């Protein structure tokens, strides 16, 4: 079932809420004095910028899904929109990784935290983060195109492998790009975050047996908002990566057509949750973080 106009209504709702909330969080992180702006604030602002850039194109995808997957915007805007979804994914996961690593420095080894802050500045980290996101999403921009697949008089924003691969290697390039995206957007960054959080939890038990109450409370607030963001990302993008990885693995495991059809039909809703995460972030910021709550 296509759910009629459920997917475009959801897309437009997340467009509005994400635009407003990301503007609000950008205003909150930018109106504060530079001294009060902590090293995590640049990551907050970069995540907000990624979400804003994605929800800018969200109306285009809402129109796309409203017209039964017809794209009246041209090849360039298909390329740019797909590039921006992927840039949002990589930039968001890298910003969450940066926040988790900044915490892992702060709680686990505060002296090493200060040492690494002196050695590596936040601006360089953010610049490298965005350059890597741009380069890793570049294949999406290069290979994307618009074409009336299935000859249904409907332009569909798909990815063309003919530029770099033949028909017998189109599957190879598709699986490679999917696996690489899954890795550098949900496995390697998330493995880094789970290692950091496991050491953080060991140090948290230590602070259950040591440390100072007030610093522990400040760490409680910051780590709480950060871990809530990480869990929301891990629950909104997990259906996406899980279903697409299962679809790729189906060719190797020879799954029944029922399961393949289930994955194909449920993927749009996984895309919905992955897109809703961007608008979900500002509400999370208001609920837990008092800084955005005060503003």
């Amino acid at each position, epitope marked *: 079932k296509s759910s009629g106009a459920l997917i475009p209504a959801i897309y437009m709702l997340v467009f509005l809420l994400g635009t407003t909330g990301n503007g609000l969080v950008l205003w909150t992180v930018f109106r504060s004095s530079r001294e009060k702006r902590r090293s995590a604030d640049i990551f907050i602002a970069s995540l907000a910028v990624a979400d804003l850039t994605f929800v800018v194109t969200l109306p285009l995808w809402a129109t796309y899904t409203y017209r*039964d*997957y017809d794209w009246p915007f041209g090849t360039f805007f298909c390329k740019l929109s*797909s590039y921006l979804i992927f840039v949002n994914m990589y930039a968001s996961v890298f910003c969450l990784t940066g926040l988790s690593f900044d915490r892992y420095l702060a709680i686990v080894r505060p002296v090493a935290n200060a040492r690494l802050r002196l050695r590596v500045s936040g601006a360089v980290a953010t610049a490298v983060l965005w350059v890597l996101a741009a380069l890793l999403a570049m294949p*999406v921009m290069v290979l*994307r195109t618009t*074409g*009336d*697949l*299935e*000859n*249904t008089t*409907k332009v*569909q924003c*798909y*990815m063309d492998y*003919s530029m770099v691969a033949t*028909v*017998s290697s*189109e*599957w190879a390039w*598709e699986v490679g790009l*999917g696996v690489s*995206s899954t890795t550098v957007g949900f496995v390697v960054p998330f493995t880094i975050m789970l290692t950091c959080y496991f050491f953080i939890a060991q140090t948290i038990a230590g602070h259950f047996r040591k440390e100072r109450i007030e610093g522990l409370r400040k760490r409680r607030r910051l780590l709480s908002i950060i871990v809530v963001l990480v869990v929301t990302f891990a629950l909104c993008w997990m259906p996406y990566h899980l*279903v*697409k990885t299962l*679809y*790729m693995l*189906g*060719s190797l495991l*020879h*799954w*029944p*057509c029922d399961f*393949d059809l289930f*994955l*194909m039909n449920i*993927f*749009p809703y996984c895309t919905c949750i992955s897109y809703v995460n961007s608008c979900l972030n500002p509400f999370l910021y208001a609920f837990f973080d008092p800084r955005f709550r005060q503003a």
Partner: nanobody, 130 residues
Framework: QVQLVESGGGSVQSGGSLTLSCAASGSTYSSHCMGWFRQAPGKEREGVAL???????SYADSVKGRFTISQDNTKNILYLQMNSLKPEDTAMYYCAAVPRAGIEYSGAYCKWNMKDSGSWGQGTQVTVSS
């Protein structure tokens, strides 16, 4: 990459319920897309029945007849139940396996625009008589 073996066809009188079973090897449902075409007098390869993720069994209006598409994943044979043999059905009917696109980017579309680069098979000469 896949190997497609067609069947059926031939000189059959009008109104018959001819069944065209296009077998395949390595062309799974999640990898490649079944479809049926027939060669025009100018060898334009006009489609007669294609499999679509958006629609499902997209039949050409001019080649409507009583054509039916049914895909059996277990035996990997696409059936073209082209019943009610029409005078327009007097053509060489070929089946093609155009690689199905991925779920991540194209939403598992069937890429019928790349029928030129797809894998084909030597069809059968349907000769619809009276």
């Amino acid at each position: 990459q896949v190997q497609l073996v067609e069947s059926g066809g031939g000189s059959v009188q009008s109104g018959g319920s001819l069944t065209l079973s296009c077998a395949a090897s390595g062309s799974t449902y999640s990898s490649h897309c079944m479809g049926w075409f027939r060669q025009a007098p100018g060898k334009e390869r006009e489609g007669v029945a294609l499999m679509t993720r958006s629609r499902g069994t997209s039949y050409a209006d001019s080649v409507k007849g009583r054509f039916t598409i049914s895909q059996d994943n277990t035996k990997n044979i696409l059936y073209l139940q082209m019943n009610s043999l029409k005078p327009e059905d007097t053509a060489m009917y070929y089946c093609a396996a155009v690689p199905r696109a991925g779920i991540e980017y194209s939403g598992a579309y069937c890429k019928w625009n790349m029928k030129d680069s797809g894998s084909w098979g030597q069809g059968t000469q349907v000769t619809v008589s009276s």
